[model samples]
Target chain A: SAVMNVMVQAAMKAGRSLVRDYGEDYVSQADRKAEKIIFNELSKARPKFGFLMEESEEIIGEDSQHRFIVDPLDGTTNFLHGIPFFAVSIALESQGKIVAGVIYNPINDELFTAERGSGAFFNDRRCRVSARRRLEDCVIATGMPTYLIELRNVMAEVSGIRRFGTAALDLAYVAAGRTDGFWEDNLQIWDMAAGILMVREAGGFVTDKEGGNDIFRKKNIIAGNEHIRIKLERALKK
Target chain B: PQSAVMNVMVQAAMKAGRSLVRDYGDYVSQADRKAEKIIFNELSKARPKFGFLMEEIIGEDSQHRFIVDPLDGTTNFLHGIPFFAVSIALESQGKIVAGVIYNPINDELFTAERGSGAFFNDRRCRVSARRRLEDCVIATGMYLIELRNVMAEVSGIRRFGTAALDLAYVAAGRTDGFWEDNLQIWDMAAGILMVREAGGFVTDKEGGNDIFRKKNIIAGNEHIRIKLERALKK
Candidate 1:
């Protein structure tokens, strides 16, 4: 509970800093500033957990078995361009398993949180994946891919496709039932660590493109409600 | 500040937005018809002299015209996504003079008038300063349909499913550029004026200024517009 409190405060503080300088010429500076605040607050609260951050290199703490994987600004391109879809993501891993996660967007004041074996939440209200049974009625979010093949394959069957430019928020949206599904390729561990837990906690399914759980190593993801997740995997593979 | 026409536009948009939010997922078409009726009745009552061009009603004989999309991003709204808006524009003697684009979910109101400037929620806004495509974040409609030609040129591409809001983001400097094809005039009329008033350029894909007819658009600041035109054309 104390760790969650510390991480939420750190994310909120950094999000405020980001909102102040948004659309200004010095947005990358704002990114670094937010990263520093999160790093300081998180490290101060849990000195034992190692750190894997987007802005800085890995830091091994005394308790090497535990670490915090953080993405201070998960959507840099969105932030630099003044889009309102970026966020701060932090996840705690103990014994190589993520146990706690927080993702905050200051502009909208949306805070998504979850702990191991606990239900997911959106701003303190319990959240879950959408109950859309058919792929034809689902709206899916994704990242821009290197080629149109993946998009074409998915778009041919789904009701609609969206590219929000923020993978973390896309995953969070899937958890909050805002969108029915999300998939992307070539994402890092920091981009998806917190989101994976959020989706799992929200009663959704997340797996690699091959229908396996090796998301971090494979760098590809397909997430949605049980039926939709399986549907997307089948569509993408075709 | 906002114009008198903008006040009416805002009122109509808010009325439509409330109804859309209430009936977002199911009966969306019914909600759309309800919004169109409300917007049409209010705008006609407010300015009886102007003709209307909208999704449901098309009037083409007045010297002054009002182009409206009561609910842009219908797909997003049906899917429970909160990224849609109401777009309105005034065309006087074949020239757009005033425009309003409102996203009720976030309460962002973008307004602009010819010879004046663009404003986002009452604060003056401008197009982004990034000149190169490699340094820009671009938005597109029908992204999956068009990614074959445009993905390799820009730093990033966003598909938000609302043409009007995407164009307004270009005006507010939130996105560096935007392009789309086969869009109706009502879907982009307000956004076109907003970008131009905010010191941006808009042209059809063939480097022409025939947006209303051709229905293909490339919008951004001068440099990015030129760069996108080249990229799309090439």
Candidate 2:
């Protein structure tokens, strides 16, 4: 609970800092300032907690048992182009297990969070993954890695497909049940660390593209309710 | 003129939007039907003689028609996505002269009248200046499997599920370009005027004004338009 509180504080503070600069330009600086805000806010709350964040790349914690994965500003392109989707993502990993996570969208101020034993929350109300079982009834979101990517089969069958450009918020949306499922390949740990926790805590599942547990090492993921994940992984794989 | 035509259409659109937001639900069809009724009732009362294209029902007047999509993004509306819209347009002698698209969720309204320019929530807006697909956020509601090549080139491809709002996004410069086929006249009539009024261009697949006939469209500023058009060809 305390870790979640610190993550929420860090994410919201950084979110505020992000919103102030959303009038456009100074993108890299905005990210820098946001990371600084999160770093100061988070480090102050837990000085020994190491960070694996966008700017720092990695900070091995003095308490090696605990690490915070932070993406101070996810959806860099959306922020640069003045698109309204992006967020501050933070996840706490205790002994190699993600125990808590929070993601805040600065533009809309929607906060999504989860604690391992506790359920996921959206703006403080408990959230869950969509219950839609029929793939034809689902709206799926995805990622487009810079090289050789196409979800033609998935796109053809799903009710809708969205590429909102933020793996963090896209996963958050799944936790909130705003979307039925999601899959993306080739992302950094910080990009999906918080999101994975949100989905699992919300009664959903997450796995690497191969339906295995090597997601953190592989840097690729599939997330949805159990049935959705099964169907998505089946379709997402070449 | 700036007299009753736009005023009627804008009033009808906003009225329908109010009804849409006031009682939104999983009943997408109910919401869609109610909105169309609200808009039609308002528009028909004010401009009783305008011909209609909504159901192909003829009206008392000729040479003028109202194209309306009471709810665009039907799937989005049903799926809890906050990206759907209400679209309305007036065609005078088959030329779109006025348009209004309202997204009730956030009360974002886009309006345009031929030769008068587009407005987003009362502020004039224009298409983005991005000339390269590599730097663009393109929106669409088309056959994605077929557009893979084009999607590969763009910085990002967004399918917001609502062509009306997609065009409104283009007109506001929120997105650089858009293309989709297999749409109805009601889905894009308003957006066509909105795009052109905002200093953007709208072309059919063959790169001309057969949009109503083809029921497909590509919209953007000229620079982005040519790039997207050529990209689609490849």
Candidate 3:
């Protein structure tokens, strides 16, 4: 719980700082700057914790087994394009298992958090995946550089499709039931570390491309309520 | 020809658009749910002589008609995507003379009249000068083959799901180009007018002016429109 608090505080603090820079031009200094703020808060709170960050190289901590994964700006292009859909992500992994996670969007001051075995929360309110069971009733989100063939085939069967450019916020949307499901072909560990936990703790399922649990290595993820997750995996795989 | 009537269109559009979000400043369903009614009532009260095409409402059989979609990107509005707009176009003798689109979430008002140039939030706006396919960021609707082709060459592709705003984005140079299919006349009438007035071009899928009959629109400055047409054929 203490680690979860640190993750939330760290992500939110960086997110708040990003708000000032986000009001500026389409430059990406906001990314590196936000990362430094996160690194400072997180490493201060857990002095010996290791780091897996987007803007910086991996920092091996004194306690190698305890690492904090961070993406200071998850939707970089969207933020640069002034699209209003980006976030700061932080996750605590203990013993190679993600135990605590936080994703913050400072524009709305909305915070999404989860701790292993506990539920996910959107701004302190418990959140869950969409109730829609049928693929036809789902609104799915995807990342770019996805297979062009898969984009069309999967879009044809779903009620709607969206490309919000921010995988972190997209996953948080699923956990909050704003979208029914999400799948992406390529990703980094920091891109989805917090989101994976958010979805899992919010009564949802997540799997790698081959329907396995080792998503950190695979770097491909499909997430949703159980029915939609299976449906998306099959559609995407096919 | 009539800037006075154009002013009325702007007023009615902004009035109806603001009415959708006046109750709750931040924004939702009760607002989007009844916007067309407000649009209808406001426009009806403004111009008693003009017939309407938004709903099946038949008025005094006037020659002028107002083509309007109270809310474009209804799905986006319902999903809280913040990329929808209120689009209104006026048709005088079967030609679009004026168009206005207002996004309530942000005050990005796009207004234009024939031969008068387009305006974004009251300042003049025009299409971008990007010439190459690889340099364009296209805003599009649902697609398959053409999409794969565009994906292969374009710098970026976005499907914001709002045809009105997509065309308006092209007008404002926020996007390089826009193409969509299965659209109704009201879905892009204002957007089409806005594009042309902003020094861009709007044509149907076949590179002709059959936009209303085909209901598939392509918009950008001349070069990008041509490129998009060729890309769709690919």
Candidate 4:
């Protein structure tokens, strides 16, 4: 409970700070600056924790037992161009395992969090994934690497693929049950850490493309309710 | 009966919306460029104290703000997607006191006051009567490139591509609810206030009002909101 509360405080404080900048400009030219400030603030509060961050190289904290994974601004391009999709993702991992996660979108004031065993929550309310079982009846959500290298593969299996910018919010959506599933490749732990656990605790499944639980290592992910996850993995694999 | 404040809100929305309509045609013809210059300059000169916050002009001042998105659907406008609107709201003393959202594409205008309720054009509108989840039509946004999770929800997902219009649709009952993975305050500032006044609920995807906290937005009627919250929940 203390960890969850700490995560919410960290997320809200950092998120509120980001929104203030989002007010100044759609795209803060100094986004890297904003992220730097957030990282500093967080690390200051959790000095004993290591950090796997998006902007900075990996931080090896004095206390190696706990690492804070952070994506200070997940959808930079969207934020830059005023597309209105971006967020901050934070997670606490111990023994290389994510035990608690928090994802917040400053633009809309939604906070999604999950503890290892407790179910996912949106604004503190218990949440669950969608129950849609059939492929045709399901409304699935996904992302592609910006390079377009995987377009051919994506077009083949997905009913449709969305390229919304922002990894933290994407995973939060999955946790919040607004989307059926989520997947992407070559991501930092900050991006997937909070969302992955959120999905798992919300009655959904998550795995690297190889069907292993090594999401942090692979950086490629597929997640959804059990039935949907199987169908998604199969579709994506093709 | 339309209140005088609603009338003022509508007038500003319509006037600003007309400017968006005119510029949108140019945006379609020329693609995305620096076209918000004229609109922003004119707005700055007219309302110096409002200190307008918009997608284009990073205008800042010490006074209270007026969050205005002259045209809410630039991508839709450029692609000729016909899903665009003008959003205007006053953030007086840090609160969204009065708001107006107009979608010229459908000629629907939504207006609201902090406690004065909300309306569709002149009609006092409430959320959809569709109590059942299956009967509802939901709306949401997806970015064109970022990844990790949004792409997972796109099977049969509707990409309206306009942030303000999506909120207007929710307010006008054109869609039961909508969620967007990434968004800006300018995109939803007015619509959030309007939707709440119309008996709809809105929050970040995580269901908090730090709307300025994260760009991820979620909103809908009571039943649809609950259903969508469940559908989008992990």
Candidate 5:
């Protein structure tokens, strides 16, 4: 539980900072203020840790065994619109192997965290993806990337799809079963690293669109409980 | 300009409103993670002894008549999207005696009675004084999931989430007409009253008044309703 303390501390510190910023401007869009705060936090958290992030570039760590991948603020569009659906995401990787992750949605005080084997917890409660097995009865969350809007064939097959603004929260939704599944393409590893592991440990599948294991390499990703994952993957093809 | 029955209905609607607002705050945080059976069970218990029919649970009381639509725009609320409301209506001896619609996000309340007239926030409210359908901004639930037939048929279909709010928008002259399918009695109960009391009409898609059992709905002022209904039917 020591690791839990460190992880929670990191998430809460980031959460408090985000909350302060949000109170000033409920919408957490692409503002100069947000950029500076997010970058500063990411940089300060792991000064030597290699950084692969949305707003900042890589900072090579001397140890070469650990890196901090992050999205300073996911769902910036939602934040910008005063939608209250944004978050701070961080993942720790040792030699490119993810050992810990945290996704905190400050507005609702819902924090999702997980490690390789310890099981997923949401706001201190054990969490699991919904046991529902069908696409028709399930609600799947998804997003079309800025460049991938031409995938009409893929968009047409979802049961009830949503384009929630955050990639990390979309993955958290699948882990939490708020959404039965989620997938998106053309994303960086910083956005996937934390949420992907959260989903997998929560008893859901996390794989590239082709059902491969290497998510960071394959830009297209799908995560969901077993049955819906298969159906969602099938839907992507049509 | 409100009747006593309307006052009761308003109280009922507000009671549900307060609970829905409190629960929705928790629902977003705990909806997926929490078992939700207890949440919904508590939600049903929020309004005891009136007949319960909701998106997540169903309750029935035959001796008396009441209609409730708790968390009407559940999807919008769940997605952290604004623009949904709670709808409550009272049916006595096969008549919609009173209605109340409360939007928790904006705290706007609209209420009406059989003859005393409709009011929004203590100001007299009426259906849009607009008559043209194209110039009118209408609302519909466009059941995008299991009910794609509605979307395939209508132009300008919207998913503002709550049906009561949609109808209230029409009553307050925000949206023009409102319609949706696959709706249960509770979904339209409060909305039907507001529209009718506000110099509008609410009827089955075929233009009948037995809304409690009708599966589809078409409502609005005469002109826009006709135009929108024609568009939906085609």
Candidate 6:
């Protein structure tokens, strides 16, 4: 409870700073400020846990049993260019399992949160994946990839594909059922730590492209309601 | 001074935008149709002489025609993505004389008149000066798979999911360039004038001004357009 509150406060504060100076060359300042707020508040709450954040690009505190994975500004490219679709993502992993997660987009003031067994929430309202099982009826979201070969097969089957350029928000959108499915390649843990938990808590499935849970090693993900998840896995690997 | 015609166009678009913002959730073609009806009635009442080329249905014809896409980014709207728009343009005497694109979510209004330049939110706007493909943020309407070749060359490819809004972004200098295929006349009529009036170049992918006929578009400031054309051709 304390961690969630602290994360929300830090994210909102940093988000205010970003919105005020959005069109400038000082976005990195906003990024660092967000990281500092999150780090200071989080470490003050639990000094024993470690931190892995985008700014530091490595782990701090050296805690073996617990860690906080953070992406203070998850869509840096979009932020710098004023695209208005990005977020602050934070997750708590205890003994190798993600126990809690939060993703906040200050521009829209939408907060997505989840705990291991409590289910997911969008701004405190319970959220879930869409029931649309037909791929042709689904609107899929994705991240920009190193190559387009991964999208070719999936594109041919879905009603349409959207690349919103932010992996964190894309995942949160899936959790909220704003989009039906998402699959992307080459993502960092900070980019997906909170999002994976959000989707799972919202009664959806998330797996590596091969339909396994080895996401960190594979750095690829496919997520949707169970039926769409399996369908996307097939199309992506095709 | 705003002409009576421009006033009517803005009023109709804003009215439609208000209805869209209030009714946007899931796939509501009925809301789109409702907005279209508002625009159509307002435009018709303002200038009963003008013809129409609307996204919904074919209507009356005159020497002066109004082209309209009541909801330009229907998919984005249905998905609650907040990037859709209302696009309207007047084609008169064999040329586009006026255009207006309104994004109700942000209250952004983009307007253009032939030889009068373009305005964003009531202030003049221009295309970006960025010339190098590697130094530009490009907006695209086609899917990711079809963009592989060109996406490799541009600085960044933004698929914001709205053709009209993407074109307005180009004119407002929010994006450095834009390209898309398989667009309809209403999807682009307003945006084409916006870009040209903002001191940018717009042509079909084949480097011609026959955008509505060809249903494909490439647009940017003069320099980026050439570079983008070359990149897309490859």
Q: Find the candidate with the highest lDDT and give its number.
A: 1
What is the overall TM-score of model 3 with all chains considered together? Answer: 0.88
Error of 6 at B202 (Å): 0.5
lDDT (Cα, 0-100) at A83 in candidate 5: 41
True contacts kept of 6: 0.46
TM-score of chain B of each: 0.93, 0.94, 0.92, 0.79, 0.77, 0.94
Cα lDDT tens digits, model 4, A156-221, are: 444444445567777777666666677778777778989999999998888986678887788888
TM-score of 2: 0.93
lDDT of 5 by residue, A1-238 (tens): 5544555566666667666765554443433444455446555655666766775667787757777777767866555433456777777787778877888887777788888797777877877886877776656666544223323434454445555567887788788777788878777787899898889889999888888887788777989999888877777766
TM-score of chain A of each: 0.97, 0.96, 0.96, 0.88, 0.85, 0.94
Inter-residue clash pairs, candidate 6: none
The fnat of each candidate, in order, is: 0.86, 0.46, 0.27, 0.00, 0.00, 0.46
For residue B139, give model 6's deviation from the true position in Å: 2.1
lDDT of 5 at A184: 81
lDDT of 6 at A204: 94
List the candidates ranked by DockQ, beginning with the highest: 1, 6, 2, 3, 5, 4
lDDT of 1 by residue, B91-182 (tens): 88888888888887777888899888999987888999998788888888864434555677788989899999999999998999999999
- List candidate 1 stretches off by more than 4 Å: A23-25, B18-25, B56-61, B143-146
What are the RMSDs of all candidates, in order? 2.4, 2.4, 3.5, 18.5, 8.6, 2.5
Q: Which ranges in model 5 have alpha carbons more than 4 Å from their true place? A: A1-7, A20-45, A146-159, B1-14, B17-67, B73-85, B89-234
| TM-score per candidate, chains pooled | 0.93, 0.93, 0.88, 0.53, 0.60, 0.92
Candidate 1's displacement at residue A225, Å, is 1.5
Cα lDDT of model 3 by residue, A1-238, tens digit: 8788878888888897788886653346788888989999998999999999985789999999999999999977667655556899998999999998899988767799999999999988899988888888888988775487678668878988887778888899898887889988778899899999999999999999788997888888999999999988888867
Better of 3 and 6 by TM-score: 6
Off by over 4 Å in 3: A1-13, A16-22, A108-110, B1-33, B58-63, B106-108, B113-124
Error of 5 at B38 (Å): 16
Worst 10 residues of 6 chain B by lDDT: B55-64
